Structure 1
């Protein structure tokens, strides 16, 4: 899928059939891996909104004047960024590596946030809730909704996706 990342229109690429069978032989736990990716993207809205909501409820000064997500414009920008990050993490889990996340999402991002005054403590908490939420889904610890997968253990993939979130946290700290 690398050409999707670098193409000018980002038009969709599709892999199925034998190409997808082959791809599932280069990464670990290919079927659980696709269920894990599916769990992230299928729930992207609620993951993002629960995570940004929690960063605010733990620090409501963030929606007061001078606050990081004061006004709808800034709240919407923050929700957008949380989704962007989440999606780069989903693509890292699909591909089994973080090179695109680091190159296209993280490189220069802390500098951008420092220039804008986007608060690092708030970003840290949004990322830690997104991580906890995704790991919760992948390990059957989500309480309202469960995944439609065969029952089993996905702890290795939870550790792997946790590491991708940790790369975000580390870069933005």
Structure 2
């Protein structure tokens, strides 16, 4: 696998060089944010169940047909599959967020996902939608926590977004 640190290393390796001082300063800074980074993750994990639950409700309010006979989220088993999937995607996203790198997400999760969905007949569009719905709810928590020292998390928040979006895009 890969993450922010390892990555920079690898790059450096092919040049054949010690790490540039400039490059260290990326990592040095990254460290400093750690605490923020962590809490972000913690927030997702803490609220996981909910995040999904929520997103689902909204997804089905919008696309009523998914839950109608002939739709893709019917019958029960399909609905369960759909829920399961949403969760998974989330799980990965979180992982990435900690790593500070998309990779884990791309390789385990996104890679081949679209085509799977296609073969099954799952409407990729809707999947993507769900991912976004999730995104918003998730940010909601990341950004509004309780008992945490107040400061600016934007930087992290945006990176979070990006991950969600890579997801949305590749699925779609």
Q: How does the TM-score come out when normalised to structure 1?
A: 0.79
**CA 1:26/1:107 → structure 2, altered by over 3 Å: closer, same or farther?**
farther
What pairs with 1:84-99 in structure 2 (closer than 5 Å)?
A: 84-99=88-103
**CA 1:106/1:148 → structure 2, altered by over 3 Å: closer, same or farther?**
same
Q: Once superposed, what is the RMSD of the aligned Cα atoms?
A: 1.7
Equivalent residues of 2:43, 2:141 under 8 A apart: yes
2:166 is the alignment partner of 1:167: yes
Matched residues, number? 147
For residue 27 of structure 1, report the CA deviation from its aligned partner.
Answer: 3.3
Q: What stretches of structure 1 move > 6 A for 4+ residues in a row?
A: none
Q: Select 1:62's aligned residue among 66, 87, 111.
A: 66
Partner of 2:150: 151
Q: Select 1:74's aligned residue among 68, 73, 78.
A: 78
Equivalent residues of 2:66, 2:72 under 8 A apart: yes
Partner of 1:7: none
Q: How does the TM-score come out when normalised to structure 2?
A: 0.80
Larger Rg over CA atoms: 2
For residues 15-67 of structure 1, the C-alpha deviation after alignment (integer angstroms, 9 at most, x for no partner) is xxxxxxxxx95735100110000011111111111112211101111100121
**For the residues of structure 2 that align with 1:101 and 1:80, how far apart are their CA atoms?**
16
Q: Select 1:42's aligned residue among 41, 46, 50.
A: 46
- Higher relative contact order, structure no. (Cα contacts within 8 Å, ≥ 6 residues apart): 2
**For the residues of structure 2 that align with 1:170 and 1:148, how far apart are their CA atoms?**
35
Partner of 1:19: none
5+ residue gaps, structure 1, are 3-23, 141-145
Greater Cα offset, 120-129 or 97-106: 120-129
